[PDB]
Amino acid sequence: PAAKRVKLD
Amino acid sequence: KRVKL
Amino acid sequence: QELPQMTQQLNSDDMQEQLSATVKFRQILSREHRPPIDVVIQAGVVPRLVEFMRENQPEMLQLEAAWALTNIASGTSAQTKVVVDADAVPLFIQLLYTGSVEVKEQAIWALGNVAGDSTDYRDYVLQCNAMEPILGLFNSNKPSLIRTATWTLSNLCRGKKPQPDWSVVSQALPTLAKLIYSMDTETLVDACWAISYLSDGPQEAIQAVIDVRIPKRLVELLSHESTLVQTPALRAVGNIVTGNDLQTQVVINAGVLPALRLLLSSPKENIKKEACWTISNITAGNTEQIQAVIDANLIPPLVKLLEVAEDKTKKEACWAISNASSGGLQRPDIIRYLVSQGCIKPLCDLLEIADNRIIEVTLDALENILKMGEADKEARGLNINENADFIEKAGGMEKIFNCQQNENDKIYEKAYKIIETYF
Incomplete structure (x- = not known):
């Protein structure tokens, strides 16, 4: 899966 | 035996 | 602002x-x-x-x-x-x-x-x-x-x-x-x-x-209701069987073959592709493990994918069947079994794929089948190689002959020897 994740909650 | 890249 | x-x-x-x-x-x-x-x-x-x-x-x-x-x-x-x-x-x-x-x-x-x-x-x-x-x-x-x-x-x-x-x-x-x-x-x-x-x-x-003791669990996760879990678990299982015969046997002992059998009919094409990939690394093992795959009834569904699955999957099925054929030298009956299950027709048909790595893999398999057929003939005074006759009837002879026109030298060398040796 994606290596990065934007954190939005 | 073949491995992934 | x-x-x-x-x-x-x-x-x-x-x-x-x-x-x-x-x-x-x-x-x-x-x-x-x-x-x-x-x-x-x-x-x-x-x-x-x-x-x-x-x-x-x-x-x-x-x-x-x-x-x-x-x-x-x-x-x-x-x-x-x-x-x-x-x-x-x-x-x-x-x-x-x-x-x-x-x-x-x-x-x-x-x-x-x-x-x-x-x-x-x-x-x-x-x-x-x-x-x-x-x-x-x-x-x-x-x-x-x-x-x-x-x-x-x-x-x-x-x-x-x-x-x-x-x-x-x-x-x-x-x-x-x-x-x-x-x-x-x-x-x-x-x-x-x-x-x-x-x-x-x-x-x-x-x-x-x-x-x-992670393998035991990975095998069980292969049947998890979500393919999001199946995908990685299958990947881990596949990577493990890239190990030696001993490590691969642990996975077989964890019952991976019957699980892979179900994956071969999965709705997700990538699951079927990777299941064949995983099987290919098991049939790349020793004689006993190739037999284990045979006993697990994986060949028939493998042959089916070889003939009707999307290309990516067929290639993987080809590797499995081909690696399995390499075992016939130690156990001829493996070849008899592969042929009885109709691998010849699909293998030949694959000779026309736009992937040289696969053509080589297919030519090797067809040659393993040719050799066994030749040995059987030599063994019992016949003058006709049964598997050579099968290949020709499957239209494989013509296709093999054509691979001699491949710009790839390795392909050329393989096809040529096959033609001059069995045809």
Whole structure:
């Protein structure tokens, strides 16, 4: 899966 | 035996 | 907009203004598409945000600042570099030890994006000794935190060229072995990915995965109701059977063959493709394991995919059947069985694929079939090679003959010998 994740909650 | 890249 | 004011407020000495400012920075950065990362970086506030993560800073400040930095690190390697050079990593790590649960949730996510940026940032985080505090998060009894930590943990294990420090990532095996028993799909998925990364390496790594008894569980997960779990688990299983015959036998003993049999009819084409890939590395094993695959009734459905599945899958089915044919030299009946199951027709038909690696693989299989047929003839005074007659009738002779026109020398050499030897 994606290596990065934007954190939005 | 073949491995992934 | 407010950015000019936000920057001034962030650098203010008043803590109420610092928090209000940090929150605004966290907010404008919370966008999945085209996040204002560069604008924030250029505002020059990164060092200040990192400063707010210091141990004695107000909790909310550490929290909002870590969250903001987390999303800056969710960008490009260039944008992530800014956070790293500002010495944020060691601070993220310390927050994992001393931060409140909420704070830790921000810090681990940040470490997840940093480690997920590249092999060097992955190694950097490992060098800062992030592993210890991270493994500690799994004893938190906190679902949301564990999910993020599992993901972060997988980015630390990911990367084959360069492979992460084995002496460090191997430390997470015991944890990963327990995690694949989690009922939380999200955690399970990432645990399986992490494991597939660790399993993708040298003999010692595969053995470490085998020693903690992970294979047994991976096989069971192959039938998990979600393909999101099936995919990584199957990948881990496949990587494990790239190991030696002994390591491969452990997976067979964990009952992987019947499981793979069901995967061969999966609705997802990539599942069928990887199932064949996995079978191919088992039939690449010794005589007994090739027989195990035969006894597991995998050949028939394998032959079916070889003839009607999408190309990517057919290629994989070809490798399996072809590696299996190599066993006929030690056990001719394996060839008799393969032929009786109709592998000849599909194999020949595949000679016309736009992939030379596969043409070679197919020509080898057809030759293993030709040799056995020849040996049978020599053995019992006949003058006709039964398998050669089968190939010709399947239209394979014409196709093989044509491979002699291939610009590839190896292909040419193979086809030529086959033609002059059996036809």
